[PDB]
Amino acid sequence: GSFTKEADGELPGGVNLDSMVTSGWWSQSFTAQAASGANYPIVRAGLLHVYAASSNFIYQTYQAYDGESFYFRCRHSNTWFPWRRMWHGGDFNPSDYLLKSGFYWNALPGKPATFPPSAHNHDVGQLTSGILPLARGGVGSNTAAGARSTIGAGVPATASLGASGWWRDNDTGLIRQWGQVTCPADADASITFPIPFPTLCLGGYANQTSAFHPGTDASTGFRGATTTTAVIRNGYFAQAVLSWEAFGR
Amino acid sequence: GSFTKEADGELPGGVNLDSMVTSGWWSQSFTAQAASGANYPIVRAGLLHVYAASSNFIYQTYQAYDGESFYFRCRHSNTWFPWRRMWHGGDFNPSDYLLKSGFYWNALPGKPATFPPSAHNHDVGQLTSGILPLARGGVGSNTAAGARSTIGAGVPATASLGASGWWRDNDTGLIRQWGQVTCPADADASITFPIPFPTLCLGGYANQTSAFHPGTDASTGFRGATTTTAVIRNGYFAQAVLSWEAFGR
Amino acid sequence: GSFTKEADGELPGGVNLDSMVTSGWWSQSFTAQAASGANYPIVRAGLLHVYAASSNFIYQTYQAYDGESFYFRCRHSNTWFPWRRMWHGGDFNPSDYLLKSGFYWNALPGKPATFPPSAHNHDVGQLTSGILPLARGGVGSNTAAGARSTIGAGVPATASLGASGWWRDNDTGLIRQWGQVTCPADADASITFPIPFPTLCLGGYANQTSAFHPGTDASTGFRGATTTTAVIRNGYFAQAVLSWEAFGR
Numbered sequence: 001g002s003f004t005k006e007a008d009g010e011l012p013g014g015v016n017l018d019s020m021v022t023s024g025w026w027s028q029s030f031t032a033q034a035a036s037g038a039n040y041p042i043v044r045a046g047l048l049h050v051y052a053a054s055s056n057f058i059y060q061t062y063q064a065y066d067g068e069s070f071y072f073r074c075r076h077s078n079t080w081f082p083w084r085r086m087w088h089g090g091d092f093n094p095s096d097y098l099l100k101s102g103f104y105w106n107a108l109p110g111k112p113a114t115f116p117p118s119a120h121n122h123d124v125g126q127l128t129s130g131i132l133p134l135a136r137g138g139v140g141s142n143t144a145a146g147a148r149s150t151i152g153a154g155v156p157a158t159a160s161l162g163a164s165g166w167w168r169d170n171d172t173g174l175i176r177q178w179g180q181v182t183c184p185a186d187a188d189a190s191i192t193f194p195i196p197f198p199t200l201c202l203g204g205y206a207n208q209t210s211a212f213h214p215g216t217d218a219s220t221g222f223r224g225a226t227t228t229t230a231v232i233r234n235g236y237f238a239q240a241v242l243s244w245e246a247f248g249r
Numbered sequence: 250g251s252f253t254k255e256a257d258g259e260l261p262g263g264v265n266l267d268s269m270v271t272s273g274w275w276s277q278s279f280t281a282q283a284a285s286g287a288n289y290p291i292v293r294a295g296l297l298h299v300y301a302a303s304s305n306f307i308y309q310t311y312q313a314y315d316g317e318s319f320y321f322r323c324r325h326s327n328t329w330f331p332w333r334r335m336w337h338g339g340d341f342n343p344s345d346y347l348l349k350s351g352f353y354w355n356a357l358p359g360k361p362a363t364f365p366p367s368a369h370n371h372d373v374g375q376l377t378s379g380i381l382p383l384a385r386g387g388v389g390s391n392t393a394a395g396a397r398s399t400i401g402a403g404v405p406a407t408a409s410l411g412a413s414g415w416w417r418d419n420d421t422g423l424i425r426q427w428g429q430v431t432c433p434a435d436a437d438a439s440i441t442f443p444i445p446f447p448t449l450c451l452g453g454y455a456n457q458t459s460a461f462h463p464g465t466d467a468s469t470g471f472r473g474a475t476t477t478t479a480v481i482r483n484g485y486f487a488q489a490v491l492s493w494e495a496f497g498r
Numbered sequence: 499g500s501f502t503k504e505a506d507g508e509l510p511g512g513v514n515l516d517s518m519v520t521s522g523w524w525s526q527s528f529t530a531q532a533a534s535g536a537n538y539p540i541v542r543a544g545l546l547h548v549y550a551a552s553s554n555f556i557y558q559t560y561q562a563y564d565g566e567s568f569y570f571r572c573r574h575s576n577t578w579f580p581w582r583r584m585w586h587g588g589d590f591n592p593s594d595y596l597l598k599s600g601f602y603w604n605a606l607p608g609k610p611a612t613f614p615p616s617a618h619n620h621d622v623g624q625l626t627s628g629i630l631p632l633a634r635g636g637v638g639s640n641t642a643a644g645a646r647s648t649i650g651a652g653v654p655a656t657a658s659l660g661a662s663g664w665w666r667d668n669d670t671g672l673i674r675q676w677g678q679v680t681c682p683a684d685a686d687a688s689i690t691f692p693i694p695f696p697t698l699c700l701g702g703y704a705n706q707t708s709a710f711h712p713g714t715d716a717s718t719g720f721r722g723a724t725t726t727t728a729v730i731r732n733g734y735f736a737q738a739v740l741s742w743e744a745f746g747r
C-alpha cells in the first residue's frame with residue numbers, strides 16, 4: 001500500500017521499536033505505554049515513522065508529543081544504530097555560553113584590584129616615606145642631630161694645631177689654647193688668645209722655656225684673663241720666653 | 250485518502266496553522282502570506298506537514314524554504330505545544346565556544362606580565378641595591394667616614410691612661426701625654442714621651458711633686474722638645490720628682 | 499501517484515541530487531555511490547525525501563544511514579539553498595562548554611597563589627624584620643653601641659664648665675678638672691675635686707693667680723692626690739690664691 005492520511009495504528013504497551021520494520025507511521029498515545037516498551041528513544045508519547053527502504057536499511061524517526069525532542073535512527077545489516085537526538089531551542093541557547101572570542105584577561109570579571117605578590121627585591125629608592133628606626137638598622141630621625149641622639153654619637157672636635165693654636169670640643173664647648181710670649185725681667189706681658197673665648201676664660205698657666213739660672217727665682221703667673229687676653233707674669237730676673245696654656249668656653 | 254506526490258494545496262494568506270488539523274502536506278509560497286497568518290513557527294515561506302495521528306494528537310512540522318530552520322510541534326488534548334526550533338550549522342559552530350577543558354589560568358590570554366601588589370611587608374634583606382638617605386632614616390653612604398659625615402659624628406678618642414700615658418683626639422690629631430721624672434738639684438733631666446708625637450710637640454710644663462722647702466726657689470721648666478723627648482729643668486736645690494704634661498700632634 | 503510503502507527506488511552511483519525533483523523517497527545503499535554523485539549533503543549512504551511542492555519549491559531531506567546527521571534544503575526559483583545540517587547529541591554536549599555564568603575570577607582554575615608584582619613604592623614601616631647593613635645605608639646593628647661601631651663613631655664628652663668644674667671624655671674615661679684655692683704663705687692647702695675621679699688622679703699642677711713680688715720665690719706644687727682631694731703647696735711668702743688643674747680616670 002501507501003502512506004495514508006490515517007495512521008497505520010496506535011502503539012500499545014510493550015512494543016519493541018526494533019520490531020516496527022514495516023513502512024508507515026504509528027502513534028504512541030501514552031507515555032506509560034512507551035515506558036513498558038523497548039528501544040524507545042525517550043520515554044514519552046510520540047509519533048513514529050518507519051521507512052523500510054530495503055531489507056538492509058530500515059529508517060525510523062520519533063517525534064515526542066511534548067516536543068522533548070525529535071529522534072532518528074537506522075537498521076543497517078541487522079544492527080540498529082543508536083538513536084540520534086536533535087538539539088533544539090528548548091535545550092539550550094548558545095548566547096548563554098562563552099565564545100572563545102570573549103575569553104581574555106580584560107573581559108574576565110571579578111578580578112581583584114590588587115594581587116598578593118611573590119618574592120621580590122626592592123631598590124632602596126622605592127622607600128619614599130617613613131624614617132627607618134634603630135630596631136631595623138636605621139637612625140630613627142631625618143636630622144643629623146636626631147641621628148646622633150638615636151645612636152649616642154658625639155660631634156667632631158675642631159682645632160688649629162699650629163705652633164700657637166687652639167682646640168675645641170664641640171660636645172661641651174670646651175676650648176683649650178696655647179702660645180708663647182716674651183716677658184721682661186720680673187714683670188708682666190699681655191697675650192692675646194689665638195681665638196676669643198666665647199664666654200669666659202676658665203684658667204691658664206705659664207711655663208719657663210729657657211735654661212734659667214737655678215740660683216734665683218723663675219716663677220710664673222697666669223692672671224687677669226678676659227675673653228681675648230690674659231696677663232703672664234715672669235718671675236725670672238732676665239727677659240724670657242714663657243709658653244702658656246689656657247682653657248674656657 | 251493517502252499522502253500524494255502532489256501537495257494537498259498552497260497556503261494562502263491569513264492561515265492559522267492551528268486550523269491545519271487534517272493529514273497532508275501544504276506549501277506556503279510567500280513569506281508575506283506567512284506574516285499575515287497565525288502560529289507560523291517563523292515568518293518565512295516553507296513546507297508544512299500535518300500528521301493527524303488521532304483526535305487527541307496532531308503533529309506538525311515546518312521546513313523554512315530558505316533553510317532558516319526546521320520546526321515541529323504537537324496538539325495534545327486541544328492545546329498546542331510550542332514550536333521547537335532545530336539548531337543547525339548555520340546558527341552557530343561549537344568550535345567557536347570555549348570548552349570547560351580550555352578554561353584555566355595558563356590558557357587565559359592577555360594576562361599582564363606584572364600585577365599591582367596588595368599590602369605586603371618586607372624583610373630588610375630584600376633591599377639589595379641603593380643607599381638609604383638621611384631623609385629616610387639612613388646614613389646616606391656605604392662608608393663609615395661617609396656615614397659620620399651625613400650625621401655630623403666624630404670618631405672615638407683613644408688613650409692609654411696609665412700612671413704615665415697618653416690621650417689622643419682622633420678628630421683633630423691632638424695628643425696629650427704625662428709622666429714623672431727624677432731631676433737632680435738645680436739641673437736638667439730628659440724625659441721620653443710614652444709615644445712619639447707624629448709631627449711635633451706643641452708645649453708642656455712641669456710640676457713639683459714634693460713638699461719643697463718654701464724658703465727657696467722651686468721653679469720648673471719644660472723646653473727643647475722633639476717628637477720623642479723633652480728637657481725638664483728643676484730649680485729646687487735638692488733632687489726632686491717632677492711630673493709633667495705635654496701636647497702635640 | 500502517492501507516497502508508497504515501498505521506496506520509489508534505489509539511487510545508484512553518479513546521481514546529482516539536484517536532478518531528484520520528483521516527489522517520493524529514495525534510498526542510497528552505498529556510501530561509495532554517494533561519493534560518485536553530486537550535491538549529496540554528506541558522503542554517506544542515506545534516505546532522501548523529495549517534496550516537489552510546486553515548480554518553484556522543491557524540498558529535500560537526507561537522513562544519513564549511520565546517523566551522521568540529518569540534512570535539509572530547498573530549491574527556490576531554480577536555485578538550491580545550501581544543505582542545513584542538524585546538530586545532535588553525537589556532535590557535542592553543551593555541558594562540556596563554559597557558561598557565561600561560570601566565567602569569573604574565583605571560578606577560573608589554576609590561578610597562582612602569588613603574582614609577580616609591578617613597580618611599587620613602600621613606606622619604611624613595612625620593613626618589619628632585619629637590620630639594614632652599612633652597604634645599604636644602614637648602621638648594621640639594632641643597638642646604639644653597635645651602630646657607632648659600624649660607622650666608627652665616638653660618644654659625646656660631658657662636662658660642667660663652671661668657674662670650677664670638670665670635663666670628661668667618655669670615649670676613654672679621661673677626666674680633667676679645675677678650681678681655685680686660697681693658700682697660706684709658704685704652706686699647703688687641700689682642695690676637693692668638683693667630682694671624684696672614679697679610679698685615680700693621674701696628675702695636676704697649680705698656678706699663681708696674683709701679681710706676686712718678683713723679688714722672691716712664688717713656686718707651686720701639686721701632690722698627694724687621691725680620688726677626691728689633693729694638696730696644693732704655695733711657695734709665695736704671702737697668702738695667695740692659686741688655681742689648679744688635675745686629670746685622671
Ligand SMILES: [Mg+2]
Nearest residue numbers: 214215466484
Ligand atoms: Mg734654685
Ligand SMILES: [Mg+2]
Nearest residue numbers: 463464715733
Ligand atoms: Mg718662699
Ligand SMILES: [Mg+2]
Nearest residue numbers: 217235712713
Ligand atoms: Mg725674681
Ligand code: NI
Nearest residue numbers: 120369371618
Ligand atoms: Ni614590595
